[PDB]
Design a protein around this ligand. Sequence first.
Ligand SMILES: C[C@]1(NC#N)CCc2ccc(-c3ncnc4[nH]ccc34)cc21
Length: 275
Amino acid sequence: PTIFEERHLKYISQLGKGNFGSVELCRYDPLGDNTGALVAVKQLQDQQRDFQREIQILKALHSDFIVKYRGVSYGSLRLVMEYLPSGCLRDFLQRHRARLDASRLLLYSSQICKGMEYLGSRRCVHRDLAARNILVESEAHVKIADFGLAKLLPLDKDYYVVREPGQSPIFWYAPESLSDNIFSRQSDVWSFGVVLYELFTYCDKSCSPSAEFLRMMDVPALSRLLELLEEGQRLPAPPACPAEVHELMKLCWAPSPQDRPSFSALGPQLDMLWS
Ligand SMILES: C[C@]1(NC#N)CCc2ccc(-c3ncnc4[nH]ccc34)cc21
């Protein structure tokens, strides 16, 4: 059931890209009559090693808040996952902003936090937590996706040091990630603070992390952002944001990783704000 034959996967369209790969919508149609199930299929476009690691990570994750691994097709050639037609949260928020209230945003925040608490329990660092990497199962259910940059922490080391600087938009990176290429479950907490900001602005482009940080900012942009952050400057409270939600973002944005709340400490606080 977890082995998908290449010849039966029928290409339909492109779903997206990210981290030198692509996601396609395919029908797994062994009958050849267009009645088979729709699946989301990820493939590559040393890269093979990081793709194999991603598959092994996702295959061992079992959560209502993490995108479901279905299987693999060999040539490992492709990663097969459940298809979520509503797509990424970032685009969903922009389209349905006039229908989703603060209660719904708090529900999504709590579900992402629960998925992140579970990833941390698995010693998994996501490294790319952003609304563009969160999928919408339904109007009341979100799931974390894209484990392309994810790392498993060894048993005796609670952080990870990357050899070369990242290729992701710099606006979600923690100061220790921007300065020393250090990543941990605490830098995932920083990124979650940016996710909370994204939810509460409904991913509005005009006040996005990139537009707002550029606005606030011969020195490179990365060094200028680090300077901004080291001074204690932070993204402003989104328009109409409840005061308590903004206070949580600021806690996620503590200068030192050790002072940031844990996902287990954040969870009951978001659950309390939701109700
Ligand atoms: C998060 C991200 N990369 C990945 N993995 C970034 C670009 C993109 C575009 C489409 C989808 C997608 N859409 C619908 N159902 C799905 N199931 C699994 C993935 C998926 C996911 C992604």
